[model samples]
Target: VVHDLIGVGFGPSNIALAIALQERAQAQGALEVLFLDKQGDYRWHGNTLVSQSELQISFLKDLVSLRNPTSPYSFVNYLHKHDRLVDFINLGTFYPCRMEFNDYLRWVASHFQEQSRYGEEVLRIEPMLSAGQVEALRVISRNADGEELVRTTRALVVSPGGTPRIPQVFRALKGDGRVFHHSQYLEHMAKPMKIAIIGGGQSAAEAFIDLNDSYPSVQADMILRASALKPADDSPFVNEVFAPKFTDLIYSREHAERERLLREYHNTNYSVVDTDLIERIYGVFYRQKVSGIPRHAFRCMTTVERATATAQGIELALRDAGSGELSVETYDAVILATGYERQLRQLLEPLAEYLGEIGRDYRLQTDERCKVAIYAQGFSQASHGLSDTLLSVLPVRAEEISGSLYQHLK
Candidate 1:
């Protein structure tokens, strides 16, 4: 039996699409769609939900609010259902804490629990041939029990999120328990007493704060190549780049123009921290100076030239970005908040030749012989602007892809 569509990952992007499809099915007719996730259950950034960490985007940009504010799956609706609508309104903040945001997503996901299959990792996709043309797709995913599950679908939406990027210096220490990416922070962050957080981004800053607040006894050193931690450009004008209309402009621009826009606004998303967070971090150092005891260090303008992990600890050979001076520092643990890499093409290598380009609707353009719809979410930052990989575009993007899929099915 063939399904109407199958979403690869049950993360926020696909969850948003699931809501859209569910709503559409309610109005039209039932659509045989299923979402497969590798995790055993629904959880949004569970490991990296640092203590008291607030979401970068406003809560209004939840699963269905931006596209359909009246939708039952909206974050506001979730809060209302949980009897916290009044309290949330009294809070008077657009940004909710990461924990509550995750709970909201989980609460929305609960409605579609039967529509998603958890603990199934999509292994690969093979073309289903019909008269020398690609008709459908054979999605083969393996469950936790080593069972291979095959599903045939007329359309496929892949929302595989970014993979943790490992620095070259720590390539040899990939599997070492002491050295890990910020993605697995909570699980691996068992007490090391002293740790070095690599990078100058939001994750690194949050990790440093989390270490200070949650693990008070543990000392942390934030090492980065930047001279200082920069503030994210969330100002109104700069933030317009994340709007849905901005994606249209970005996609219409030439390759060089799009690249220029990406570089021009790089600080808005990459290697920058919120001003409030920057101030809070600075306060930590300021209080340390008053007490005449520094428990943590912010090693800016520093790059890890090499890292050697021994049984005792991990030693990092840091190089000064300004001068050629070098220094060696050792820490019981190292957390690499170096961000993630989106390599969606690698996952669909089997359809590499047929996958011409990604359309504005986030669907991959295929040759005349291919009839299946292959939509990719969270991998079109270059063409769709920065919002493609962020929460800001989820609701709108889901609507666009859902419409495209609905038209295709017709």
Candidate 2:
């Protein structure tokens, strides 16, 4: 049977789409939708959820709240169902702990068990041709036991998410246990005498804090090109760019202005840390000074020139950004929080000819001969604004795509 829609990845973005579609299906006729996920089960940011890791966005920007506040899939509803509604209100904070948010996402995902298949990594999408016209999409995926599975869909929604970006200098040591990205911190991190964290972003800050707090014997050095940790601008006026309506303002601009706007507001998300975390990091350094025994080093304005895995440990050749001086250091482990690369195009290569420009509704504009509707999520930052890649627009984006999918299915 050809499903109405098959979402490529079942992360937060597709999960929000599921909620939107299901809610609409209740009012209208049911849409035969199924989601395939790469993970063994539903998990959101599961690996790097350290004790100090709290969500940067508000809880109200959950799966369904922005689009349908009364929907049961909202984070508020999750709190109500978990018997922590009163307790959460008492805390009086918009942001929730990362672990709790993950649990909330899991709770929402549990409601759609029959609609999702876990541990299926989608390989690519091929157009199903008939009578010299593209009729549908053939989604090829691989399961855990090295088996290929094929599913056909009338409409496809792709939200494959980002791939962990390792710096070119450390590319050769990708699989080495001693050096790993912050995404694998919880699983690959082990007790070590010395650790080196690369980057000045939120993930890097969290890793530095976790290592100092969790491991007494570990001494960490945070190496970054920035002279100091920069705080993200989430103030009232500046935060308006992430609202759903702001997407209209952004998409209306020409290509050059859009590029300017992105550069103007780059600090809001990229390579920045929370003010509270920055203060906590400063306090850690302050306390170290008071004790007259430094356990950690904030090696600012430093870049990794080269890295090599040697008998001693992971050796890093660091160069000062301001000065021309260079120094070498070795560490038992290295954690790279360099961020992610969105690789959506690679998966859609097979369907390139049929795919045209992306529509404002997140649908990929297809050729007239192609009947299948294809939508994208989490990688439309260029056309949809920065919120396209963030949690800020998920609910509204899902609603938009769901409406479009409904019209096409008819």
Candidate 3:
């Protein structure tokens, strides 16, 4: 038929899956998949890409190399074809510049024009039932030209964007273009002004470094903190938690224990920074107290405790530690992005219970294995661990999801 697996997003997650499926079809025959995205074109984090950033993970863990080394579509292949093989070897490191890696991803995406459609947003997914059982999923999308296209498939894989977690301060400055994520540190271009470092962990520290080292005239004011930022636990044994094998261990655990494991490893991604980073920041402050007219200041009792932003500065309402006093201040810029609830439509309310409870194969646990296979790529973080959100596990994870989809569609 025209299609079997209907992908909801065309980012790296689904892009990786499509590549795996295409490769697998060499033996299993063609896997007809149609992908739709809200983006007008192919670009990772588009406007958000900053020059100050580099991918956190190594390039070895690319789309297919981790699972099928010999696959022609690999990061290694991209480098070779782009004629940067020698330049890359000269600059030896797994970590790649944000834009460089984005280019690599786009290069891979360019060849698969027949598999994807851009500038199309997935608005809703409705379940079609037969005899009181879900038999297929109806995906509704709106194109840039104000046209609607609907598609259905037996196997559905949805990888939505990160829940846009911003603060009221951002809402206040939403239209001003001043409020932005730390990823766009350089892009924001506030070298001649003050900035507000909101959180206590690595993200905050990163924002701190970029500002302090960046400008001589303007300084960044950090909200005071209770404790010094600490180093992340990436020791050999501790790192096993991020391994593909470890995800298997995490998924098999009871729900409560699973929560406990995620909490234990929470620092791995959240608020945690490398030891060298801690030193680099501390080294900067160690020499200069960063005081002249006091452009920067720290307010400790709370950070991200309660936050907001405005046209002039970010608003932080603080409480007097023991006396229970209230104070509010505004900063020019902000960091450490806050939370946004996933906007799943009412059609999915029936499977709400299992939404947060995805499995190793990226499938939602159902009442009795319904005919429609519900698979997730991005939201599987709770079940899959830190690698689920980044490029670390794409090669391995994509293959698993594709295998599961093949079994379902067959």
Candidate 4:
């Protein structure tokens, strides 16, 4: 059977697309769309959904409302259904707790459950060639019964989502009992423990603060590669990169140069934590200092050189980036708060032959509309800037992708 649109990976990006397409189909009475997710049900980043973690952007930028304010699936609508709209408004804050926001997203996803296929893992996507242009995508999925299913679609939207990145040095710790990525904190934190967290991002900071506060008797250390915890770049001017204007400017540059600038300027909007969280962490550190009995240790200006698993714990070799000296320490577990990479292209390898060669360096050769040769949702980053990867723009992106799918299908 052929579908008008096939959205892979039911993350927020595709969730928004699903909502938009469903609403459009309902309004038009003839459109067809199907969304596939590997998980059995809709689940956001539940592992990292720490107790106090707040959304960096306002709740108003939810899956659909930002693009179509009157949509029934708006975050505001969800709050109203749950009787929290007034309470949320009374709080007089824009940012909502990450947990509550995720609840809102799950609620939104539930509204489109009939349009999505859960527990279906996409194995590969093969482009259907026609003349010189790609016309459709053959999506292969594996079900729980080990049955293979094929769904062909005129347009495909792939949002594989971000993967937690662990540094190469810590690969050996994967199977070790104690080591874990900060992404898996909720599961690991339940056990009795003394833990050491690496990295200096909001995740790392939150993990350090939470672990230290929860287990007051347990020793917690936050290892940083910088001299001190750096603030996330959330300034208004820097925030502009997420605007439509910046996407055009950034994508127009050479790919290598664009990548360079992304790395350089990402700290401005991507890498840091909330200022309030920073202040709270600082208070905890100061409290430890005043007591002279340290509960939280901040190992800044140091990089992990080597990590060896031991019977009691893991020994980490720390090297001072500024100085050429190294030091060693052991911890019950090491939480790699290291960041994520934009490696979703690997999933497109199956359809690469149909993509055709375009651009000087071959950066996926997307058209101005953010559509790849046979895909519906891959080009937004090329046309929409850094906001493409962010939740703030998912609503509009979903609408754009849905419109593109509708046009291509016709």
Candidate 5:
């Protein structure tokens, strides 16, 4: 069937798109739109939905607020519908628990479930030619029964989301079942207790806190390569990374400089733990002095030189980040909270011929409204700044992309 727009992946990006289109349809008329996801239902970071984990951004920055505060799809409106407005107000905090916020998203998903095709995995997309201008896109998807279906659309919004990237050493040990990436938080928790978590970011911190709390009898060790845990530079000024102003700054800078700045400034979003987690870790350490039991170990300024699976679990060779001295340790499982990269090029391989003229240097090039080129990954970091990838600017981005898509259709 032909669609005005076919969105690949019903994650947050396209979820916003769906809401945008819905509001537009309500005000004007219907816009033929369809969204597809491999999963049978809407799920956002299901594995990482640790109990009590709160959102880093305020609830005000929900699906439609930043774009159109008056939209009924806003979080506030959702709260009112569920009669949780008073409770949310009493909480007196902008950020809600990750689980609750995810629930909100699920609620939003149900509202537009009719427009989405769940349990359908998109395999490939073929652009149709029309009068020298790329017109329609053929989306090939497979259903649960192995039935292939083709859908056509004037434009496609691809928001596959971030893929969990494991280090080379960990990737080699994937099947052994002893190594895991942070994205598999709940899955890894079912295994043995004695765990070694690598990396010094928020995910690492969450893993450490959760494992330590859940398995008090087992020891949990965190190996941080940095000398100290750096704070996430979520300050308002640094938050400008994802702002429209920074896009030009990032694109104009040299590639090396971009990488350097990304690493240097990433502390704003990356390489930091939540304040509550930090306090919890501190409390554990403080109590350890009283009990004289080293249940949790924070190996700061340390690096893992090598890791190998053993019968008990995995053997790790650790080296001092400064001195380069090595130490050996063993654990039942090794959790690599190493994080992800913005590499969308791999998925666009099938459409490379059409995208040959597209340049890489930038992550994703979005127009002023943040609507990326057809078949193009949206790289807003250079322009939008760090907030681009964060929930803080999601509402605005949702509106921007919506307007851009509408303009494209015109």
Candidate 6:
């Protein structure tokens, strides 16, 4: 049996796409759309979730609101359904907290139980050839019991969000508990008084701030290559670049300019902290001066040249960016808040030669003989622009991808 579409990952992007597909199916009968996620159940960013973290985007920019306001599955609708709209309104905030948003997404994902499967990890996608032409995709997956499952689909949407990046210097500490990625914060968030939170990104800032309040006995050192934490430029007009319309405007340009524009606006998304968060972090530092409390500190313009794990703790060889001064430091643990990688070259190894190039509509520019429609979310940043991987533009992108699938698969 074959499906009209098979989504590889059940993260927010594909979840929105599933909503779009359901909307279309309601109007024009049904299509066999199925989604597969490796997670045991539905959860987004289960770890590294701090009590103070709020979404960078607004509530209206949620799942289906921007694309279809009347959709019953909107975050606003979720609040109303749960009888918490008044409570949310009283908060007087455009962005919801991380915990509540996760609940909202979980509520939406629960409705599609019949069409999705969890606790199943996709192994690889190989081309299902017919008459020497690629016409469908064979998706092979393994469940917890080690049972193999296979699916063939005419279309594919891969949306695995990101891979945790561990620096080469700490590669030897792989799987060791003393050193871990930021994504594993939930498991590793305990009993550290003298620790190093490494990175110049939002996660680095969040961990540094949260630990100071949660663990009064803890002393944390925030280390990064930047001299100071940079504030995210979410100012009006500058924020418009993340709008749905601008995705096309950016993609329609020549490659050089597209790359140029993306680089110029990199601070808007990458290694940056919210303006208020930057100030809050600074206030904490300022208080340290006023109250003579040095429970937390920032070590900037520093790079880890090497790392070696010892029985007592982790040792880091660091160099000061300005003075080229080399120093060795030890900590109870090293938290790599350095962030993620989004490249898919190796994951798509089987279809490396046939993926062709990405088109404006998120379709793969496949060979003439290939009839299978291929699309990607969260992986086409260069072709779809920066918003491809962000929650800010998911509703609009979902609508666009749904329309693209209809034209190709109809």
C-alpha local distance difference test of each model: 0.90, 0.90, 0.71, 0.74, 0.74, 0.86
What number of clashing residue pairs does each candidate have, in the order they appear?
0, 0, 7, 3, 14, 0
Stretches of model 6 off by over 4 angstroms after superposition = 190-192
Candidate 6 lDDT tens digits, 41-93: 67789887788788888888899887898998899899999999999899999
lDDT by residue (138-212, candidate 2, tens digit) is 999999888999999999999988889989999999788999999989988634499999999999999999988
TM-score of 2: 0.97
Clashes of 1: 0
What is candidate 2's CA lDDT for residue 370? 88
lDDT: which is higher, 1 or 3? 1
Clashing residue pairs, backbone N/CA/C < 3 A, model 1: none
In the order shown, what is each candidate's alpha-carbon RMSD?
1.4, 1.3, 3.6, 3.6, 3.8, 1.4
Q: For candidate 1, lDDT tens digit of each residue in 190-282?
A: 434889999998999999999999897899999988889899998998999988899899999999999999999998899899999999999
Give Cα distance to truth, residue 197, candidate 4, Å.
Answer: 0.8
Residue 75, model 4: lDDT of: 81
lDDT of 5 by residue, 33-137 (tens): 888898885668888988757788768778777668887878898889999999989989988888888888888888787788999988887756666545677
Candidate 3, 318-364: lDDT as tens digits:
66464557777665656543323344455365445434467678887
> Over 4 Å off in model 1, which ranges?
none
Per-candidate TM-scores read 0.97, 0.97, 0.85, 0.88, 0.88, 0.97
Model 4 steric clash total:
3
Candidate number achieving the greatest lDDT relative to the actual structure: 2
RMSD of 6: 1.4
**Backbone clash pairs in model 6 (N, Cα, C under 3 Å; residues 3+ apart or in different chains), count:** 0
lDDT tens digits, residues 1-410, model 4? 77776777787878887777776776655566788888875668888887777888878778876678998888888889998899988899888888888888788888776778988888888766666556667889987777899988766666777677988989977898688887678887675456788888888888877776667667888888877776878688777776645655776887777777677776765557778888998998898788897767888888888999888789999998877899888888888888776556545777655454222111345434333334434344544456766786677666665665566555
